[PDB]
C-alpha cells in the first residue's frame, strides 16, 4: 500500500 502512495514521489 506505501509504495502504491509513494509512487506519487
Ligand atoms: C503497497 O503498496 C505494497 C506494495 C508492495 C508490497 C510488496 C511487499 C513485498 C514484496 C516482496 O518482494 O517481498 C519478498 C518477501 C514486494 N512488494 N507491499 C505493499
Ligand atoms: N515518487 N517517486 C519517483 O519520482 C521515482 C521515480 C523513479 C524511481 C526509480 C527508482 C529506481 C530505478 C531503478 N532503475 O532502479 C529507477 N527509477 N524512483 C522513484
Ligand atoms: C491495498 C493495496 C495493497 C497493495 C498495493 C500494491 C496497493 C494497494
Ligand atoms: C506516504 C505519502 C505518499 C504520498 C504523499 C503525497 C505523501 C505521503
Request: proline content about 0%.
Amino acid at each position: 500500500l506505501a509504495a502504491a502512495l509513494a509512487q506519487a514521489l
